[PDB]
Amino acid sequence: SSAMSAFERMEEKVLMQESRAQALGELAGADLETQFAQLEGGSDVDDELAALK
Amino acid sequence: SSAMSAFERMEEKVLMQESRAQALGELAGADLETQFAQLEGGSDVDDELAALK
Amino acid sequence: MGLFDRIKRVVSSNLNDLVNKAEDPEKMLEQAILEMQEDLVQLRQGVAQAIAAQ
Amino acid sequence: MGLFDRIKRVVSSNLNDLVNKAEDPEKMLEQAILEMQEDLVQLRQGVAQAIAAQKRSEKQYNDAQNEINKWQRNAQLALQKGDENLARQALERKKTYTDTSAALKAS
Amino acid sequence: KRSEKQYNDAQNEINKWQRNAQLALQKGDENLARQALERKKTYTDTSAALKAS
Amino acid sequence: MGLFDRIKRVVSSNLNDLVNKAEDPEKMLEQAILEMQEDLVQLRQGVAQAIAAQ
Amino acid sequence: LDTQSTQVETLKRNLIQLESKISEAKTKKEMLKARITTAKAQEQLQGMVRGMNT
Amino acid sequence: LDTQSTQVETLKRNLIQLESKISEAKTKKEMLKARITTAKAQEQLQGMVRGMNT
């Protein structure tokens, strides 16, 4: 459909745009271990969560 | 008859048109279980009907 | 002719891309809503007509 | 004509030398860097686009792989009422989506 | 000596946030203390970066 | 033409250097901050709009 | 009249479902438009990796 | 009706397979288009072998 083919197109456009936006940082990065630390805080955050909880 | 052959023709046309209209959704569908839930609400609606009744 | 087919597909592949160039994601989505709403109005008009006939 | 060829080569050999005259070694090197950097930007944009396309196509595979089990869940929820046709069709659709998932994982 | 200001704030805050989490969990709410922990981790990362700087 | 390419690159290599000449290190850094802050404002406006939509 | 009652109820269900669909679709439209507005400026503003200008 | 049931199921299998094919084909289309975009600029930018300009 016309109004439904416009919607799906812009939707896929949105998806690709967000993927690129995340890719720029995903492409860059201070260091692979820095990337992983950014992904996951590490033992520090787990210990803090356990202690406060 | 002329006026009676026009009527029956457009009638069958109506039937096929409605069949297609239902077919599009019948052809599509989020999931077979989603299709069945759309067909029938499930235990939730039966329980609600029993409780309110 | 295969020549004509391929030359035509070649000429479409430039208009298609100019159109994709003048696409704007936010602004474009508006029509996808406006036209949906308009044809929804038409559909509910038909629904009302059936109700009224009954 | 050979006459035209040689007269043209004669006229180029003067513009070429005026251009070599207005050449400055330091200042000139700047463009050799600026344009390299700009086209490097373009190349890395393409690299990012490829990365993003892969990270997007991962979406359907993730859906299908989690679905390879969501379909068992649906079949269980169906057979819990005692119907086997619904669970069987869930199995068929799960096999379809599993083949899709395998193809997408290879991709 | 001015950039030291933000680091001092964040370092004293690395403990003020534990104080806030304690004052929150003293009513029996864990979401507030957990969000306090998350913000404390954020401010601790900020403090570490600022201390290196 | 290669002639035109090289003559154009020759003319750019003088404007580029006049621009580098009228560069001032301290004063210049100010824009690198002002524009960052302005587009940060725009980004946080978008963030707020998403929050509000939810 | 009973037949038309069935028809109008099956036509009532139709319209309710399609109105729900267009409404949820508009909700998604707004959330994704906010997404776009975030991204548009977001890609002019990111980490300051020393090895690029962008 | 049973015969048409067989027909419609064999027609259901047909369409599922062909939709899968077109979808995977579009996936390949996107990945290869990214490939092309890499290559296009890539061939203007390569190692600086002293014995060529290119």
Author numbering:
A (entry chain A), B (entry chain A): 162 to 214
C (entry chain A), F (entry chain A): 1 to 54
D (entry chain A): 1 to 107
E (entry chain A): 55 to 107
G (entry chain A), H (entry chain A): 108 to 161
From the manuscript:
The ESCRT-III-like protein Vipp1 couples filament polymerization with membrane remodeling. It assembles planar sheets as well as 3D rings and helical polymers, all implicated in mitigating plastid-associated membrane stress. PspA activity is triggered by agents that threaten inner membrane integrity, including phage, mislocalized secretins, and antibiotics, whereas Vipp1 is a plastid component in cyanobacteria, algae, and plants, in which it functions in thylakoid membrane biogenesis and repair. Given that two-dimensional (2D) planar sheets share a close geometric relationship with helical lattices, and as a means of understanding the interconnectedness of Vipp1 polymers including rings, spirals and planar sheets, we determined the structure of four Vipp1 helical filaments by cryo-EM.
Specifically, Vipp1 and a Vipp1 interface 3 mutant, Vipp1-F197K/L200K1, were assembled using equivalent helical parameters and lattices and were termed Vipp1L1 and Vipp1F197K/L200K_L1, respectively. Compared with the Vipp1Δα61–219 sample, Vipp1 was characterized by unfurled ring stacks or helical-like ribbons with fewer and shorter ordered helical filaments, suggesting a reduced stability for helical polymerization. Although the Fourier transforms of Vipp1L1 and Vipp1Δα6_L2 class averages were similar with closely related lattices, only helical parameters with a rise of 2.37 Å and a rotation of −75.86° yielded a Vipp1L1 map at an overall resolution of 3.7 Å. Map local resolution range was wider than other Vipp1 helical forms with the inner parts of the filament well resolved compared with the periphery, where the hairpin tips and helix α5 were more poorly ordered. The Vipp1L1 subunit was built between amino acids 1–214 and assembled using similar interfaces as for Vipp1Δα6_L2 and Vipp1Δα6_L3. However, the Vipp1L1 subunit differed from the Vipp1Δα6_L2 and Vipp1Δα6_L3 subunits, with its hairpin tip kinked at Ile68 and helix α5 compacted such that interfaces 1 and 3 were perturbed. Although map relating to the CTD could not be assigned, our structures were consistent with this motif destabilizing interface 1, possibly through kinking of the hairpin while directly or indirectly limiting the formation of interface 3. Compared with Vipp1Δα6_L2 and Vipp1Δα6_L3, the Vipp1L1 filament was constricted with a 21.0 nm and 10.5 nm external and inner diameter, respectively. Specifically, the left-handed 21-start helix in Vipp1Δα6_L2 and Vipp1Δα6_L3 that runs nearly parallel to the helix axis formed a 19-start helix in Vipp1L1. Overall, the comparison of Vipp1L1, Vipp1Δα6_L2, and Vipp1Δα6_L3 filaments provided a mechanism for constriction wherein CTD-mediated adjustments to lattice assembly induced a reduction of ESCRT-III-like protofilaments and consequently a reduction in filament circumference.
